[PDB]
Design a binder for this molecule. Structure first.
Ligand SMILES: CC(C)=CCC/C(C)=C/CSP(=O)(O)OP(=O)(O)O
Ligand SMILES: O=C1C(O)=CC(=O)c2c(O)cc(O)cc21
Ligand SMILES: [Mg+2]
Length: 301
């Protein structure tokens, strides 16, 4: 429906406007049109995310895509929206759906850059482990090379994976995390092994509240690029930052970002990302939600 495309895009501009970011329609409209059938409210998920520091001048969007519509990356490449990297990443999404059960897909882009990634959701009652994932031919070798470490910290079940075709990186979204894993002692030990920024008390408190944790890996080396802790909540003041600027900006976004599910509070997903020399903050304000998010809020918020 051409109507849904316009509705979604307008909302995207609205979310971007709050951050002072302009949307490149030539890069966005073509993509929304291609997946116009998924933009229908009901069982669709759409998120508009902001980030601090370096990525403060950008705005990302995530749109769920049912598997019934077919491999999303095969679609964008075939439609000439994105060029094949020529690397294993081009086959990872196809191989994943070829080796494991995928319950849903998702496309991810940036308002000025365009399409950049896809997601592969697995059945909650049948999520793969690190072993099954590392077996995928096109999966980064780093996944297998970090299997022991993951097990040592209770990172086993993965609710989904994402592929960034531009940076050639893979995220593993671990789920069903144990309290032990999120303990301050466990978190510090983990970050130290990965050589990442050491979170302070505020950061540690956020980690403990996390419902999901995801490391980013690459095909070049076996070193994890970064690790992100995600918290889902209806609370608009959870940004784990001591910066007056972040406190104000994230709160503004969390209370004004567009959303269609009027009748309920805005679903928000905050992220604390730790990189080798620093940490930055993220916040996804959901424009479309489903029972999945509703269930997560009841369980972790
Ligand atoms: C349910 C849907 C459509 C997906 C939401 C997207 C999601 C889980 C956010 C992770 S992405 P992100 O936090 O931006 O981190 P990076 O790709 O930069 O590593
Ligand atoms: O945003 C969601 C989301 O909307 C639903 C999820 O199940 C999920 C997950 O398992 C892990 C994540 O890092 C994020 C999410
Ligand atoms: Mg993003």
């Amino acid at each position: 429906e051409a109507a849904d495309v316009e509705r979604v895009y307008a909302a995207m501009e609205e979310a971007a406007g709050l951050l002072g970011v302009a949307c490149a329609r030539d890069k966005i409209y073509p993509l929304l049109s291609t997946f116009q059938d998924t933009l229908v409210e009901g069982g669709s998920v759409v998120v508009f995310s902001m980030a601090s520091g370096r990525h403060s001048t950008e705005l990302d969007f995530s749109i769920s895509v049912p598997t019934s519509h077919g491999d999303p990356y095969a679609t964008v490449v075939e439609k000439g929206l994105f060029p094949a990297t020529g690397h294993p990443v081009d086959d990872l999404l196809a191989d994943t759906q070829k080796h494991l059960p995928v319950s849903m897909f998702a496309i991810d882009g940036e308002v000025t850059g365009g399409f950049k990634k896809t997601y592969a959701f697995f059945p909650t009652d049948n999520m793969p482990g690190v072993a099954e994932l590392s077996a995928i031919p096109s999966m980064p070798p780093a996944v297998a090379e970090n299997a022991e470490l993951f097990a040592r910290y209770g990172l086993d079940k993965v609710q989904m994976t994402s592929m960034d075709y531009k940076k050639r990186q893979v995220n593993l979204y671990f789920s069903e995390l144990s309290a032990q894993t999120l303990e301050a002692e466990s978190v510090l030990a983990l970050v130290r092994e990965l050589g990442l920024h050491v979170p302070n008390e505020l950061g540690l408190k956020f980690c403990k509240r996390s419902f999901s944790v995801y490391p980013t890996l690459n095909w070049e080396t076996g070193k994890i690029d970064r690790l992100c802790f995600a918290v889902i909540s209806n609370d608009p003041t959870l940004v784990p930052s001591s910066d007056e600027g972040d406190i104000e900006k994230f709160h503004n976004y969390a209370t004004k970002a567009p959303y269609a599910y009027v009748g309920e509070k805005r679903t928000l997903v905050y992220g604390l990302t730790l990189s080798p020399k620093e940490e930055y903050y993220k916040l996804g304000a959901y424009y479309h939600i489903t029972d999945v998010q509703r269930g997560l809020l009841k369980a972790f918020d």
